[model samples]
Target: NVPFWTEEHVRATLPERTYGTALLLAGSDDMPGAALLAGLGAMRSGLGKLVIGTSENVIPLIVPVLPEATYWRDGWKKAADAQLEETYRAIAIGPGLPQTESVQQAVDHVLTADCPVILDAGALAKRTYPKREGPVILTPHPGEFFRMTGVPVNELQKKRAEYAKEWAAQLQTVIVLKGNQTVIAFPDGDCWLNPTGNGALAKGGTGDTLTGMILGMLCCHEDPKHAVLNAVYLHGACAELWTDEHSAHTLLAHELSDILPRVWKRFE
Candidate 1:
């Protein structure tokens, strides 16, 4: 059985200040909100600064909502050609991209960097990773998880923790198997079940929010493992808080970021 990452753990490990910068490689012309939602999630989750690497066309869409974030215009395309020059405390990719050869090339270059990296949405592909010091975290819903592991969703759902743990060890990366009671499995055998959240988080964009939260938390926390655990826990807790006064069916993904301040304060 997996243990719960309790509130005590979160409080004890919370950072003293928002001191790190994060890079988010997300968004495109078609899905601009992926970048906006992710950017908002990171900024609200205690990141000092954020740089969004998105298409030039998509950059304007995010500026109004997240004026604090700097832009890397056409960053996704640039990343396809070569490695990113500047380093960051944490990096995340694939929120609103197409799964193509170019994206894979960018993924290859990103893996070379020494920072905690998050692979989600279009970045969640069937591929192996190279050895690196920083943790590579994959946030996949059941359908995406099936794409990575080749296990049918039905079979994998029956044994979520088992498959997550197996794949985490095999890939030597962290696996956040997202769903009801999300499973968080680490490369070295530690695993936990998130006990918060409800049907409200079933909508789209929520996972993107989660990817950003994890990205932001990675920048602040000392341990990559604890950072992931706290992000997952707080994400669901925000959803649960929504249902306290509002209907679960009415919750929006962006509202999760809005509710995070109060929800995080409870633990701190």
Candidate 2:
């Protein structure tokens, strides 16, 4: 049976040092904010360092907001050509990328490295994963989940956990099915329902922020599963906190990260 990822569990399992580098492959000329948002999420989520692999032009846009992060100019294109040379505690891809064959090639290259991997936004596609040491995490909203599994969004909503569990096992990867009470399904038969979050999180860049949070958490947490769970729990908690005084409709995706420091402190 799937259990809720409780605040107590998060506090108990959090790593002693929430510091490490994460490699983020995101953003494009058209949607540069994806990189900045994800970078901010990672930096604030206790990651000591962050390296963004995006288009050359997009690098400057991200630097002003996140000066701490380094850039891999045309890194996506480079990864598509060959495997990543540097290692990272965690890695996340997609976000602002286009749905294309080249992006798929970069995903293939990223999988070769032995680190927890997160695929979100444009990185998600109908595909299979090869066996690897680290967990392969796929974060998809209902529409994107539908694209991955060919399940109708309406039908899947009725049994979100069930479908996510089935697919996680079949694909031999972890699936974070995003929605009301997001489902966290692992290939090893472990499943969880996140008990936090509300409609205040229904914004454009929230998902991207979540992907970055998970990536940073993986670097800090010993168990990758716990990393994923904590990130989901805290991400929603931030939104929930927003609605306490601020209007739900007024919440912005970037504000979730802004609210995180205090929100996370509550659990600690």
Candidate 3:
């Protein structure tokens, strides 16, 4: 079977027993939509519980949209306070977190976790970002990636495989290089290139959405690499479907939020 990134794929892969919480260490007021994107996708993708730690200011706006997420106001403020003895099934970190104090604290704590952590955006900024953590997935757009690894995006575009593997190896983590042909690289020279989606995904928040999708998939599957590949495929496929009617120009983040289910329904 092709294992389409659908509700079935999510359900079938997930253990019958309940998985615990999926924590999203997202951005602050500056990245309000980050929580919205991750919360909605993680909940809809079949995580039994979703936790979001972000700015209190943006909580009111996003809490309503993502009733599924339990927003943590003070937990992510410092590393010592962020530990969850409850055990998260997985984590999607840094949609909007900066290279600041509090954000670094949260990312630092996750690094020591024994479970999977999906690191993206500002979470990828800190130099101490985990390099050898087991089951860690790093998603970076070209610009954030270049800044973190000191590699040029243009150069990466030309030699996508080489750059992605190098970055992933250097970090000792899985690398997801997001773009037209989103690249996924394992630390061991293995890589997968997605041939889906369109220019519609060029906008903001989509990467956050992608992070959510992968996080959701990870909730169901044990292998982070396969889960991320499914996410890349599913994200692009949803965009391709939307661009059919709506102008690829106006597809907003909230709009794309619901499109994943529509594509999942196709496999029904």
Candidate 4:
């Protein structure tokens, strides 16, 4: 029988490695915090490089908050035409991105991109997605999943694993079904319910952070299956570290922000 996921399993599956530049296809005029945290998470999560593509207005905000994040001010709408793909090893999209016409156009560019992608947030909520022919990681919460599949959240809760599996198959991509017991599903019918996190991580901008963490892992790690699995495990593991000392009701997403370093250190 396939074994349940353990820290040892996570360690073995995700042996540490260095990463090159990651193309972060994210940003929006509306929510700069999402971009800041997602980009900051990449810098803090041990990725060797990060290049963010967003609106020009985002640069001032992200640079001041996360000076480590490199900006790709050429913009996401024209990302496919721009030099967005030249230097990055992987592509991570969404976070603060809205479903504006420009953003949708950018998503179209990503559909044809050679880099592996992590699609999250507004991208998941958006109706239009390029016909992705490459590896993709879709991180969706219950609401987004409901929007994505037109299935009720109650229905998803009853059979989260199965629903995730079906979604992964349908999309031909990996699905990180976000929730209390986050489930990661593969196109091959394989799935795992994450065993980390208390209720402390249930908040806005949290999923955006998760999306960044996974993309960072994918940037350094060549194995998509292992990268995704370890990312899911580690993301929760970091939240668990913060949950140990903080109350679920009192803790904020920012409070546990530094916890990722400790988790990554263990892997190092």
Q: Could you estimate the TM-score for every candidate?
A: 0.98, 0.97, 0.88, 0.90
Candidate 1 segments exceeding 4 Å error: none
Give a tens-digit lDDT track for model 3, residues 1-268.
1122444444454333275578887767777778788777777665678878777887787777777678777445644355665577888888877667566667777777767888888777737444544577888888888877888778767886778887777777888888777778887767777767899999988888888877877787666666777777777888989989889998876566698778766643
List ranges where model 4 is wrong by over 4 Å.
1-3, 80-85, 125-133
Error of 3 at 82 (Å): 5.0
Model 4: lDDT to the true structure: 0.75
How many angstroms is residue 47 displaced in model 3 relative to the true structure, after the best TM-score fit?
A: 0.9
lDDT of each: 0.91, 0.91, 0.74, 0.75
- Please list all clashing residue pairs in model 4, or write none if there are none: none
In model 2, the clashing pairs are none
Tens digit of per-residue lDDT, candidate 4, span 1-268: 2234678778776655446788777767778778777886667655788888878887888887778777778567667454444746678888888755565556666767677788888777535344555577889998889988988998889888888888888877788898888888887778887877777778777777777878787776767777777777777787778756766667555444478777767865
Cα misplacement distance, residue 156 of candidate 1 (Å): 0.4
**Candidate 2, superposed: residue stretches over 4 Å from native:** none
TM-score (C-alpha, index-matched) for candidate 3? 0.88
Q: Pick by TM-score: which candidate is best?
A: 1
- Residue 180 in candidate 4 has what lDDT? 81
